[PDB]
Amino acid sequence: GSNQNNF
Ligand SMILES: [Zn+2]
């Protein structure tokens, strides 16, 4: 799957 990190 895909992964996104929004700090
Ligand atoms: Zn993955």
Approximate helicity band? under 10%
Largest sheet: none
Portion in beta strands: under 5%
Distance between the termini: 20 Å
Please give the count of helices: 0
Count of individual beta strands: 0
Q: What structural category arises from helix and sheet content?
A: little secondary structure
Bound molecules: zinc ion
Radius of gyration over alpha carbons? 7 Å
- Tell me, briefly, the overall form: rod-shaped
Give keywords.
monomer, 7 residues, little secondary structure, 0% helix, binds zinc ion
Provide an overview of this structure.
- This protein is largely without helices or strands and 7 residues long.
- The chain contains no helices and no strands.
- The termini are far apart.
- The chain binds zinc ion.
